[PDB]
Amino acid sequence: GTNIRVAIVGYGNLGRSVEKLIAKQPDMDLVGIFSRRATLDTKTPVFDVADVDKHADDVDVLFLCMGSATDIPEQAPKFAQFACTVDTYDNHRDIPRHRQVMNEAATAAGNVALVSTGWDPGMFSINRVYAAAVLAEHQQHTFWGPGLSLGHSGALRRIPGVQKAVQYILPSEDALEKARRGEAGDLTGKQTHKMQCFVVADAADHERIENDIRTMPDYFVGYEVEVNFIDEATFDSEHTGMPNGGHVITTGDTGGFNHTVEYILKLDRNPDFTASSQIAFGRAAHRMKQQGQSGAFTVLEVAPYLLSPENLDDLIARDV
Amino acid sequence: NIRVAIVGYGNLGRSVEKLIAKQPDMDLVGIFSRRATLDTKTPVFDVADVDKHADDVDVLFLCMGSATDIPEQAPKFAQFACTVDTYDNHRDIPRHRQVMNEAATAAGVALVSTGWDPGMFSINRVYAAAVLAEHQQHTFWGPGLSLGHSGALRRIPGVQKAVQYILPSEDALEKARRGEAGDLTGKQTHKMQCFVVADAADHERIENDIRTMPDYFVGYEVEVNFIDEATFDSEHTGMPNGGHVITTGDTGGFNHTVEYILKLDRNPDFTASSQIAFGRAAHRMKQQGQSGAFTVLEVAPYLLSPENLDDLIARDV
């Protein structure tokens, strides 16, 4: 009968995208931003994160958007005391433990926490599991589509003499079709993708900068890397977006017959799509709690209809 | 381990039988047909003997050919086990679901309208529209053999052999991808291709019978090819299919495109695979208890997999 009352913790790119996109939901009221700064450039009310407790009964869902993950394992189980919880935690090995901690805190409070939402983890996770479950002895992969890598871009920017820079990760197109035709069992991670850098620097610094890039352990060493030096005008016009996306490809045999399942995302702006996903799962957490709560859940444990702003009957009548 | 039997032995039922033998966690009890002899080593029982396997069952795979059979036979098929059907008569699906829900409240859970459309395409329609706040969305039915249209061609007087394919307009596909396909519908987004074997004296009349056939062909762009019988037998006897679910949204001057693609060498083989997974899920609403009638929109993903949640969580998220 009434709107879901939501708030955001943190105000980096993900936070800003969520704030923007709440304006487009029929059933959500953004009641505030929780920050460690007293002032932000927005009309949305701004409070201190230490004061979250004094707003508990005013908030139904907290969107956790704390920049610099690390904050999630340390701060997010306390946030579960006061509202339902949605996060985008992407440390692929720490996720099973994060879940169990969240589970206890939420079950105590009688709230629902949804964990590791977004598109990967998130939509790609859902597609890996549906497709593998449907095809018998499948092959399945995952390509990270042509897009901006934030971590690799940060690593470039720090190199002495680098004034501006971006790194992109690109799926090998030969590897794509080999996956579609089941011809890709033996490909290692070093063969499925290439890397492409664009750098602005003084000409005297180029030789050393390219050496610095190609010899950098873990980020660049085992990979196919292209290094392009460009002027600043070119950089500012073409390389300041945040594109991303990917493919998830699955195949399988049913006795001399092949089948291919492929899921593709093509995103002009990475945090906007991550925020979209995060927002829909917040609608789901609230709804689960009103039908009778529980603990923490991954995106694998939520029925599809819970994300939608439409009634279930309305969905069944069209869409199915 | 798990309790399964199949009703029907047409293309779908055959496909389901073939694939149950690769499930690490599924046993095939037998096939409920009207005949008493089929071409398989699987035990064959008659359809009305309901009873004495009904405590040796959890869920029957409903694979009756000639759909219309399951608005009839499926509501009482319910109170013996659990149900998995692939009912694809949209518009009747909401009504079917209710009368299923009543008869399911008898220890059973009924999962209805599984397969890939309805089924996987349903799931993908709903996820992408839920996520992208003000979306445009289109479904395309892939380069594929249409069973219904192919049957309708074959019945025409003088047609000896025939097949029909439905094909997406490639203009419409990339129009959808760029978010400018809002003005279009079925008769614009798809094309039809026929291949027919018939005596040359009958070509003029047969082509007019095809092109003026209501519900199947009128209004569509239709290509009609008359070909010799050897060419027909070598090139046109498979059952390929597939499709496209394409969704776009804007987030304030930025576009996002979501696309889901199926390419299937053999339609009933992939349909049967989806039916299986939902069979396991239908059970799996087992020692979680409680039940009724549900669509694929009402089933959390992990239930499809023969693996436990923690292994999926640790591996696939």
From Swiss-Prot, chain B:
Catalytic activity: meso-2,6-diaminopimelate + NADP(+) + H2O = (S)-2-amino-6-oxoheptanedioate + NH4(+) + NADPH + H(+)
Record-listed substrate binding positions: 88, 117, 141, 147-148, 166, 192, 241, 267
Enzyme superclass (EC): oxidoreductase
One Gene Ontology term from the biological process aspect of the record: lysine biosynthetic process via diaminopimelate
Listed pathway(s): Amino-acid biosynthesis; L-lysine biosynthesis via DAP pathway; DL-2,6-diaminopimelate from (S)-tetrahydrodipicolinate: step 1/1
Residues given in the record as NADP(+) binding sites: 9-12, 33-35, 63-66, 86-88, 114-118
Activity regulation details: The enzyme is also inhibited by L-cysteine, and by p-chloromercuribenzoate, iodoacetic acid and HgCl(2) in vitro.
pH dependence of function: Optimum pH is about 9.8 for the oxidative deamination of meso-diaminopimelate and 7.9 for the reductive amination of L-2-amino-6-oxopimelate.
Keyword NADP part of the UniProt annotation: yes
Gene3D superfamilies: Dihydrodipicolinate Reductase, domain 2, NAD(P)-binding Rossmann-like Domain
SUPFAM superfamilies assigned: Glyceraldehyde-3-phosphate dehydrogenase-like, C-terminal domain, NAD(P)-binding Rossmann-fold domains
Keyword entries, A-Z: Amino-acid biosynthesis, Diaminopimelate biosynthesis, Lysine biosynthesis, NADP, Oxidoreductase
GO MF, one example: diaminopimelate dehydrogenase activity
InterPro entries to which the protein is assigned, alphabetical: Diaminopimelate_DH_Ddh (IPR010190), Meso-DAP_DH_C (IPR032094), NAD(P)-bd_dom_sf (IPR036291)
UniProt EC number: 1.4.1.16
Function summary: Probably plays a role in lysine biosynthesis.
UniProt-listed NCBIfam families: DAP-DH
Annotated family: Belongs to the diaminopimelate dehydrogenase family.
Subunit description: Homodimer.
Domain-related comment: Is composed of three domains: a dinucleotide binding domain, a dimerization domain, and a substrate-binding domain.
Name this protein carries in UniProt: Meso-diaminopimelate D-dehydrogenase
Organism: Corynebacterium glutamicum (strain ATCC 13032 / DSM 20300 / JCM 1318 / BCRC 11384 / CCUG 27702 / LMG 3730 / NBRC 12168 / NCIMB 10025 / NRRL B-2784 / 534)
